[PDB]
């Protein structure tokens, strides 16, 4: 459909540049942060479903799938959580991330570690430790399916997605940088998940490569 391009908030662009440009070997933290976000989104639909059960008509299973695709050089995290509205994508989430971003940057200047990004609520952006491009497909009840995409550089796009319906939730598609293909391997993904994400209350299925 028609693609709309937007500038990130100045503070968010700056955090993204920092994540992309800083020498920082502990890149695997991205996966814990994205799992955390997926888990939060599942909590939200589960909670809402307690006062409006019809919110689960778009899909009853609450789960997280992690899917490596070597041929495409993608690692995808799929959740069946609440999903994001257009307003979330374009404005609202970035608006709330502003204050967390500022505090995190301040902590970094005062000697904090990039692994504390989650404690500031802006862990999503750690995706850029490993991805050159992130595509996000998302569907909230009573809104339509959207595709968001950013290769950083200060901007992102949003468009109506006409791909396969996901029913409800979010797919985070990480287009990995060339030297980060370890996150496509079985043992590596399992090792990182076990390490950092032991106590998440929804089933996480780590899919295997077919070839
Ligand atoms: N798989 C996921 N599914 C879901 S569904 C949902 C809506 N539901 C909302 C999410 C917001 N919640 C509030 C809060 O959690 C509060 N808070 C503030 N400070 C610490 N906590 C929050 C967290 C981060 C933030 F920027 C703004 C916030 F208001 C309440 C329910 C959000 C969401 N995301 C997600 C999570 C964090 C993100 C982003 C996405 N982004 C993002 C990512 C791609 C494109 C555009 C934008 C960039 C900011 O960060 C997931 O990744
Ligand atoms: Cl923004
Ligand atoms: Cl609510
Ligand atoms: Cl909206
Ligand atoms: Cl809903
Ligand atoms: Cl498996």
UniProtKB/Swiss-Prot annotation:
Tell me how the protein is altered or processed after translation: Ubiquitinated in the presence of STUB1-UBE2D1 complex (in vitro).
The reported effect of residue 79 to A is:
Impaired ATP-binding. Strong interaction with HIF1A, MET, KEAP1 and RHOBTB2. Loss of interaction with HSF1 and ERBB2
Segments carrying the region annotation (Interaction with NR3C1) are 1-211
Cystine residue pairs? none
Q: What induces it?
A: By heat shock.
Identify the residues that bind ATP: 37, 79, 98, 124
List site positions: Cleaved under oxidative stress.
117-118
The cellular location(s) given in this protein's UniProt record come to: Cytoplasm; Melanosome; Nucleus; Secreted
Q: Which domain of life is it from?
A: Eukaryota
In this UniProt entry, the residues modified to N6-succinyllysine are: 210
Positions of region (Interaction with BIRC2): 1-205
Similarity field: Belongs to the heat shock protein 90 family.
Described purpose of this protein according to its UniProt entry = Molecular chaperone that promotes the maturation, structural maintenance and proper regulation of specific target proteins involved for instance in cell cycle control and signal transduction. Undergoes a functional cycle linked to its ATPase activity. This cycle probably induces conformational changes in the client proteins, thereby causing their activation. Interacts dynamically with various co-chaperones that modulate its substrate recognition, ATPase cycle and chaperone function.
Q: Report quaternary structure and partners.
A: Monomer. Homodimer. Forms a complex with CDK6 and CDC37. Interacts with UNC45A; binding to UNC45A involves 2 UNC45A monomers per HSP90AB1 dimer. Interacts with CHORDC1. Interacts with DNAJC7. Interacts with FKBP4. May interact with NWD1. Interacts with SGTA. Interacts with HSF1 in an ATP-dependent manner. Interacts with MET; the interaction suppresses MET kinase activity. Interacts with ERBB2 in an ATP-dependent manner; the interaction suppresses ERBB2 kinase activity. Interacts with HIF1A, KEAP1 and RHOBTB2. Interacts with STUB1 and SMAD3. Interacts with XPO1 and AHSA1. Interacts with BIRC2.
Q: What does the UniProt entry state concerning the protein's domains?
A: The TPR repeat-binding motif mediates interaction with TPR repeat-containing proteins.
What protein name does the entry list?
Heat shock protein HSP 90-beta
- The encoding gene is HSP90AB1
């Amino acid at each position: 459909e028609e693609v709309e391009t937007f500038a990130f908030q100045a503070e968010i662009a700056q955090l993204m540049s920092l994540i992309i440009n800083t020498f920082y070997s502990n890149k695997e933290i991205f996966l814990r942060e994205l799992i955390s976000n997926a888990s939060d989104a599942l909590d939200k639909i589960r909670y809402e479903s307690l006062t409006d059960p019809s919110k689960l008509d778009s899909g009853k299973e609450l789960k997280i799938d992690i899917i490596p695709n070597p041929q495409e050089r993608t690692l995808t995290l799929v959740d069946t959580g609440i999903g994001m509205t257009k307003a979330d994508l374009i404005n609202n989430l970035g608006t709330i991330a502003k204050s967390g971003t500022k505090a995190f940057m301040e902590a970094l200047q005062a000697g904090a570690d990039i692994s504390m990004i989650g404690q500031f609520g802006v862990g999503f952006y750690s995706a850029y430790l490993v991805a050159e491009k992130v595509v996000v497909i998302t569907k909230h009840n009573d809104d339509e399916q959207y595709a968001w995409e950013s290769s950083a550089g200060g901007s992102f796009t949003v468009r109506a997605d006409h791909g396969e319906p996901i029913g409800r939730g979010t797919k985070v598609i990480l287009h990995l940088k060339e030297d980060q293909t370890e996150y496509l391997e079985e043992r590596r993904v399992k090792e990182v998940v076990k390490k950092h994400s032991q106590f998440i209350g929804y089933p996480i299925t780590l899919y295997l490569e077919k070839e």
